[PDB]
Design a binder for these strands. Structure first.
Lengths: 1140, 402
DNA sequence: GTCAGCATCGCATCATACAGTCA
DNA sequence: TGACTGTATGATGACGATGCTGAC
């Protein structure tokens, strides 16, 4: 069949929800952020945000309101999932242990029912007596709290008003009272009901139906001393209570619809409002009194605070700081100053959080490393639109370059004990040593009295008692700082050469062949302590002390020639504590003792590129938890360094690497430099917190980026991106975009803001000809807002806008390709369009335009109109495949530089999505599922091979291989259809089978073949076959890869095992979660393995790992019926994490 | 009304509509305005055309209610152009039962007054596989494909049997029986997942059997012959059926015991031939013997969301007109049977297949052909939803598109 | 010598009658 | 012995198809 594996490559970045309260403790203020399936909690401290805990849920978080019941120490959190899983959650801390425990849980499903159009609404009454749920039309669901029911059992009431806009529980009432807007033939209205869980029924609400504007869309319960409801529409702003009634219609609000609100002051004096254009408003409630005190409310005031990203939710925090949850752009921490700026904004940005969503179009490019690129780009939207470039690993920014070939080793040096910065960088060469001083950008060359320049240095640096140290092949030399001469010199009693060296501030250990010497550094003397000879040649040494300073190391790490072993010896006795055999015939070239995240490790690198790492116990010197990774093919040099007061490890090789810790686990991140041979940390005033790197021809100095798995560079476009294509031969990208301009009414159209298209270096406008819809053009000023589409050419390095071609009025850009055609050696950009008019629902007209870009300028070469929407197009064997309405057309590129139809297929309702492999063609239809086409070379014609007879509304399509087809679907589900490979009857060959089904919980907009994973460096043969990425509305990026049936069964069983112990966070079953689920049907998952689940196997405890194993049956690839251990399962999941 | 604005938005983006009817402009409006009817031109301008909505979906800016709705006006388009009739084949007698293949889009199987079944395909020709009945008392009043193996069909008969037989027509086994007759089953249904079969009688009892043997059923439901039984797709355990009793009788297949102890029963001014839950399972569309169409919610199964007045009726040799759901979008197709005594807004009413919105009840379309002037009774869209099969004029009709 | 223009012919739902059981 | 539950009956309504005329 088909067997697929899905893992998250990038967690969702869009902020779906915004609620304030504390929850973590009574004393701290907490911020909770829902990112689809991910819930993030922070505490606001001082101009900052602190992560305390991040959890996943087996559900799309739909409701996030946390309530505090009488006699409870802190808020609890109610979350309702899109599959309607409800739960009440509590924050539990136990020393260093943090666990989110489930107090109450339940689904509250209605077996039969139509989910409402304005979606799920969750509310909690002010006395925390119940949860209100608007799930379906005509029904109001009520969850009684009163502690237990522990299962959150519920009942339905009949709501006579069948269409509900918004509901809130009122404050200051005797009985729980709801206030909601509904629409009927009589317009829309504000109503109140008392909720009597007593009797399970409704009672007459305290308020008279009032009459309100038709687009009043949001209800706000104003707290006491005031109570009542505020109702926000598009035109007006009203306050509602029993006899009091207030209405306002501010003109500033008309320009854009208010979409969210947040309470600033607990007394309900002030509110924050956000609209679809990202405008931030302040709503103030003016207090007044009559006798001794009151609630009057006076009147209503609205103020503009400034501009933010378009907000999905708002929460005020403290000291003028507001968090802005955005779905369409970057989320923000924003400051509201009392001084408005030149534009009149009170808003100033403090921090931005990267959001890749919505991810609309994307591509995989190899440009950065030329061998294999692993670059992933995506798109933002509206004023928030952007391109995002996403990269695995760590890059370096060079600030200086000096060519010294044959440089052997690097050490930083502090000649002045007084400024504490390195003013010196010491370099080594074969049989000689050079000193380089650092004054700002300047280096050159210098002498250092006490350091020799005619022996090769193996180590040098700062040592104890205001001294410098240099260890050569001839001797180890101690050197004073202030007065500058040789204070002490150690040589082997027979003058043999030093072979290996290790040194810290107060200790020196050097090897001589098999001999080992431990020296201590004292004032003016190097004192030789006891000494021994080892069984074989010493390969490598390290005496980095782990602990506090200390600065005396009790341990000594060592590698041998003969037995290729890593052993830990004690100082000064050199007593063996652990001999670890590394295996093979390749000697260890580097060994290092380190501390990551308070945990200790031993790293040991061979000349192979292989790297062993072990848990190290500093008290016993025991090496545990052997693990092996591969880091290139050359031998790897390991060097410790500091960044952001954290400890990291740089690895020099044909694939240079940084080793570091996150979530108490070792991670290996790539360095995009071609090659690194030697490396030392550098901190000069000319180069702060820098790195000195060296290869076999040049020596470089510069800084290094933040330590993280993925690098994201943002290139703001200030308009909506739609599609993107890379063009090798032009060294640039093509981008479809559109900007909004408003009717000035007398002259033309003007832009809201500057953008890529109004700021291009060069520009071009469509001049036709015609259609002709001109000459009585039949177009209007109605609906004053207009989209204007452009093709942008963005340079691949600077990401600057090289060229912007604006398309015709009312022309709509749908498709973009980069390719060459026919016998033409020229590379073209090809764009498919549609004409979009307000008074015509589906396009009757469209275009396919062929552009050539050469040196700034794009001439349109092809220019051919066809009748319909050009939904999709793709390069097809030197031909152009295109979707136009219900038609799939194949174009040939003729010698006359024009597009000539060769082939036609007509059997579609609407062909939105096209994908091709070899001669096969996948057409995705809007309502008519999936289509497998074939081009027939001998007929020059199309043949309809097979189709999927299951109705699906597709969002995206991909071919995994000639038999297997990946589909993304409206209900956040993936499915796979295959060609019946067994021929038999026509029936089965015209049938694609859905052999895979899987609920993603995300809406996929784009599929593409590729990997950000390098080559191997294995392994290989490879774990999985193929690599397909996808981008989603929430900004999530995922990966799909193929598995053999044996592996699929291995990981499937592990899941069922993993599923008994997690825990589930609200106790949602992984089963059902991943189950295909639409309005129509439901079903368990098949053909898909949840990579996120399997990967979380590493995050479980050791004993739990063993409990998961049990009777699980391993195969190592040859004749294994055998049982498995804790370590065998770990290695696989470790393998599975490296594929993304 | 509210309806006018509601259709024209067709919502997200809202920025059209929202006007409270413009305060009546300024009335109904008073004197000359719109009018209602003229709500039509604006429907023409207000729309923010599709491929504009598709993009908003992918931005998460618009809800599925938007796109799905707006897709159904791209269905209503191509519907008006459905006017072509792709194929027609007869057998004999009149068309009675219709079964759309659950999977295969070109495969439809229809029943007869005479116990004849035709299996029919497109792009094919290759004349259909046939089975001939005795032709007098052989009336098969309902037909359901066997979900398990598509070569078999569950078919209810006037012969005194509800059976499963291979399309080669050699019967496998019989479930419900007579041993007497002067009575027969009429209604039938199967739910794939449930593996329940349920069948009706003219006397008013049902008999429900598990796909194999072993009934617990047959307690008389109501007094008169039962025209249809509907097993809800989204619910296994429960049911709804149709009788001349002028009652719907929504049921629970399991915990119903007491001999007509039921949950909700829905009264009608007349007898009812159709039950027909929606693929949601969350609505019940009922077709009544003279004029009416009932839509019922799952929120208060008692009060129907609303009625669409339609000209159907009973005639003896007319096969009872049954309204049916679109499997995908929200739409109703009932065959229209014009009478002098209707309220009709369009005499003289050429006799056509009619399409209604649902959730509104207005007519979004009508299907007519000359050279088949035939009155439409059975109209059931294909599970894909791109094709409509009508067994009416003594023949079968597939429309599809040019 | 095809043509519309009648005519008979095919257990539905409704109203009745006076036979069978069966708590 | 009420009840109901089941069998002959004949009024009413008004869609086809097939039969056959009278006649353009």
């Amino acid at each position: 069949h088909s067997y697929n594996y899905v893992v998250t490559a990038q967690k969702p970045t869009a902020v779906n929800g915004c609620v304030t309260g504390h929850f973590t403790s009574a004393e701290d203020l907490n911020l909770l952020i829902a990112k689809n399936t991910r819930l993030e909690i922070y505490v606001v401290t001082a101009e900052g945000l602190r992560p305390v805990k991040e959890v996943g849920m087996y559900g799309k978080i739909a409701v996030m309101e946390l309530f505090r019941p009488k006699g409870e120490s802190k808020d609890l959190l109610f979350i309702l999932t899109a599959k309607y899983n409800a739960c009440i959650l509590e924050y539990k801390q136990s020393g260093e242990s943090i666990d989110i425990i489930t107090r109450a849980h339940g689904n509250v499903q209605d077996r039969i029912g139509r989910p409402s159009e304005t979606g799920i609404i969750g509310i909690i009454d002010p006395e925390c007596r119940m949860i209100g749920l608007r799930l379906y039309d005509g029904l109001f669901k009520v969850i009684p709290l009163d502690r237990d029911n522990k299962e959150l059992k519920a009942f339905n009431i009949r709501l006579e008003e069948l269409h509900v806009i918004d509901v809130k529980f009122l404050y200051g009432c005797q009985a729980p009272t709801i206030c909601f807007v509904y629409q009927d033939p009589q317009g829309r209205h504000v109503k109140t009901y008392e909720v009597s869980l007593r009797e399970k029924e409704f009672n007459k609400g305290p308020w008279k139906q009032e009459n309100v504007e038709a687009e009043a869309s949001m209800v706000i319960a104003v707290p006491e001393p005031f109570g009542g409801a505020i109702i926000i529409g598009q035109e007006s702003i009203t306050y509602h209570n029993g006899d009091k009634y207030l209405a306002i219609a501010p003109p500033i609000i008309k320009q854009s619809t208010i979409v969210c609100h947040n309470r600033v002051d607990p007394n309900g004096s002030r509110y924050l409002l956000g609209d679809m254009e990202g405008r931030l408003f302040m709503l103030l409630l003016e207090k007044e009194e009559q006798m001794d005190g009151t609630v009057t409310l006076k009147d209503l005031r609205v103020e503009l605070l400034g501009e933010t990203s378009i907000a999905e939710c708002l929460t005020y925090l403290d000291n003028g700081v507001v968090f802005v949850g955005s779905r369409l752009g970057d989320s923000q921490l924003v400051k509201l100053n009392v001084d408005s700026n030149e534009q009149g904004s009170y808003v100033v940005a403090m921090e931005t959080f990267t959001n890749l969503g919505p991810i609309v179009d994307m591509c995989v490019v190899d440009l950065e490393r030329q061998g294999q690129g692993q670059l992933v780009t995506c798109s933002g939207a509206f004023k928030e639109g952007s391109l995002r470039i996403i990269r695995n690993g760590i890059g370096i920014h060079e600030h200086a370059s000096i060519d010294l070939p044959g440089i052997k080793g690097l050490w930083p040096l502090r000649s002045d004990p007084n400024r504490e910065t390195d003013d010196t960088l010491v370099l080594s060469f074969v049989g000689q040593t050079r000193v380089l001083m650092l004054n700002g950008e300047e280096v050159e060359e210098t002498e250092l009295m006490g350091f020799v320049d005619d022996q090769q240095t193996f180590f040098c640096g700062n040592v104890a008692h205001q001294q410098l140290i240099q260890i050569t092949s001839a001797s180890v030399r101690l050197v004073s700082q202030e007065p500058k001469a040789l204070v002490s010199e150690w040589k082997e009693p027979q003058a043999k050469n030093i072979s290996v060296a290790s040194c810290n501030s107060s200790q020196v250990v050097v090897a001589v062949g098999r001999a080992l010497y431990y020296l201590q550094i004292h004032p003016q003397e190097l004192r030789q302590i006891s000494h021994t000879e080892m069984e074989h040649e010493v390969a490598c040494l390290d005496i980095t002390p782990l602990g506090d300073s200390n600065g005396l190391s009790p341990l000594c790490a060592i590698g041998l020639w003969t037995d290729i072993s890593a052993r830990i010896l004690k100082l000064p006795s050199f007593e063996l504590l652990h001999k670890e055999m590394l295996g093979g015939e390749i000697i260890p070239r580097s060994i290092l003792m380190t501390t990551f995240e308070s945990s200790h490790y031993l790293l040991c690198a061979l000349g192979d590129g292989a790297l062993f790492y072990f848990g190290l116990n500093i008290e016993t010197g025991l090496l545990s938890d052997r693990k092996k990774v591969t880091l290139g093919t050359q031998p790897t040099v390991l060097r410790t360094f500091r960044s952001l007061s954290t400890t990291n490890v740089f690895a020099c090789s044909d694939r240079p690497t940084v080793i570091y810790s996150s979530n108490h686990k070792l991670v290996f991140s790539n360095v995009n430099l071609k090659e690194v041979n030697y490396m030392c940390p550098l901190n000069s005033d000319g180069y702060p917190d820098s790195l000195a790197l060296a290869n076999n021809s040049t020596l470089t100095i510069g800084t290094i980026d933040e330590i993280q798995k993925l690098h994201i560079r943002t290139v703001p476009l200030y308009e909506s991106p739609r599609k993107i294509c890379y063009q090798e031969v032009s060294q640039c990208f093509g981008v479809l975009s559109s900007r909004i301009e408003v009717q000035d009414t007398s002259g033309g159209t003007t832009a809201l803001r500057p953008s890529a298209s109004t700021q291009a270096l060069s520009s071009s406008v469509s001049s036709s000809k015609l259609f002709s819809s001109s000459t009585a053009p039949h177009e209007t000023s109605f609906g004053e807002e207009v989209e204007v589409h452009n093709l942008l050419i963005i340079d691949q390095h600077t990401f600057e806008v090289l060229h912007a071609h604006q398309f015709l009025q009312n022309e709509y850009a749908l498709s973009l390709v980069s390719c060459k055609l026919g016998k033409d050696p020229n590379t073209y950009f090809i764009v498919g369009t549609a004409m979009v008019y307000p008074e015509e629902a589906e396009p009757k007209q469209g275009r396919i335009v062929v552009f050539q870009y050469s040196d700034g300028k794009l001439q349109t070469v092809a220019e051919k109109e066809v009748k319909g929407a050009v939904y999709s197009m793709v390069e097809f064997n030197g031909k152009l495949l295109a979707s136009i309405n219900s038609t799939v057309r194949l174009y040939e590129w003729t010698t006359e530089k024009e597009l000539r139809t060769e082939c036609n297929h007509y059997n579609n309702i609407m062909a939105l999505y096209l994908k091709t492999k070899g001669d096969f063609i996948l057409v995705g239809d809007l309502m008519r599922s999936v289509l497998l086409l074939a081009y027939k070379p001998m007929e020059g014609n199309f043949e309809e091979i097979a189709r999927d007879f299951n109705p699906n509304w597709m969002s995206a399509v991909e071919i995994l291989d000639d038999d297997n087809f990946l589909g993304a679907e409206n209900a956040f589900n993936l499915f796979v259809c295959q060609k019946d490979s067994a021929a038999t009857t026509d029936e089965e060959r015209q049938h694609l089978q859905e052999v895979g089904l899987f609920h993603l919980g995300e809406f996929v907009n784009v599929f593409c073949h590729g990997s950000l994973v390098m080559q191997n460096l294995g392994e290989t043969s490879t774990p999985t076959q193929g690599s397909v990425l996808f981008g989603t509305v929430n900004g999530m990026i995922g990966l799909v890869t193929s598995l053999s049936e044996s592996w699929y069964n291995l990981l499937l069983d592990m899941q069922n095992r993993l599923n008994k112990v997690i825990k589930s966070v609200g106790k949602i079953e992984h089963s059902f979660w991943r189950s295909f689920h639409t309005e129509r049907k439901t079903e368990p998952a098949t053909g898909f393995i949840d990579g996120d689940l399997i990967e979380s196997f590493l995050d479980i405890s050791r004993p739990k790992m063993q409990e998961v194993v049990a009777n699980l049956q391993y195969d190592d690839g040859s004749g294994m019926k055998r049982e498995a251990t804790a370590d065998d399962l770990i290695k696989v999941v470790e393998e599975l994490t490296r594929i993304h | 009304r509210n309806k006018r604005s509601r259709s024209p938005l067709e919502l997200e983006p809202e920025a059209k509509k929202l006007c409270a009817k413009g305060s009546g402009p300024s009335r109904r409006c008073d004197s000359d305005c719109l009018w209602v009817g003229l709500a039509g031109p604006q429907i023409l301008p207000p729309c923010r055309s599709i491929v504009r909505t598709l993009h908003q979906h992918k931005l998460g800016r618009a809800s599925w209610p938007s796109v799905q709705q707006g897709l159904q006006q791209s269905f209503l388009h191509t519907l008006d152009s459905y006017r072509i009739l792709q194929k027609a084949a007869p057998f004999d007698r009149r068309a009675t039962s219709l079964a759309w293949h659950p999977t295969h889009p070109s495969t439809v199987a229809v029943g007869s007054k005479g116990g004849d079944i035709m299996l029919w395909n497109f792009g094919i020709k290759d004349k259909p596989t046939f089975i001939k009945g005795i032709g007098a008392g052989g009336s098969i009043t309902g037909l359901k494909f066997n979900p398990l193996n598509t070569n078999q069909f569950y078919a209810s008969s006037m012969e005194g049997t509800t059976r499963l037989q291979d399309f080669k027509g050699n019967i496998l086994r019989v479930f419900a029986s007579s041993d007497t007759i002067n009575i027969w089953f009429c209604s039938l249904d199967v739910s794939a997942s449930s593996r329940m079969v349920v069948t009706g009688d003219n006397v008013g009892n049902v008999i429900l059997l598990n796909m194999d043997g072993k009934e617990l059923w047959n307690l008389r439901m109501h007094k008169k012959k039962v025209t249809h039984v509907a097993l809800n797709p989204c619910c296994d355990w429960f049911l709804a059926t149709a009788s001349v009793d002028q009652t719907v009788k929504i049921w629970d297949l399991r915990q119903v015991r007491g001999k007509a102890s039921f949950l909700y029963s829905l009264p009608h001014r007349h007898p009812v031939n159709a039950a027909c839950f929606s693929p949601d399972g969350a609505r019940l569309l009922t077709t009544d013997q003279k004029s009416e169409i009932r839509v019922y919610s799952a929120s208060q199964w008692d009060c129907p969301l609303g009625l669409i007045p339609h000209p159907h009726r009973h005639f003896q040799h007319l096969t009872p007109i049954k309204a049916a759901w679109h499997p995908r979008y929200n739409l109703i197709v009932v065959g229209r049977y014009p009478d002098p005594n209707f309220k009709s807004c369009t005499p003289y009413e050429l006799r056509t297949i009619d399409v209604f919105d649902g959730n509104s009840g207005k007519m979004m379309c009508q299907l007519y052909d000359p050279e088949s002037s035939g009155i439409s009774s059975l109209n059931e869209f294909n599970p894909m939803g791109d094709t409509l099969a009508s067994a009416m004029g003594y023949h079968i009709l597939i429309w599809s598109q040019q």
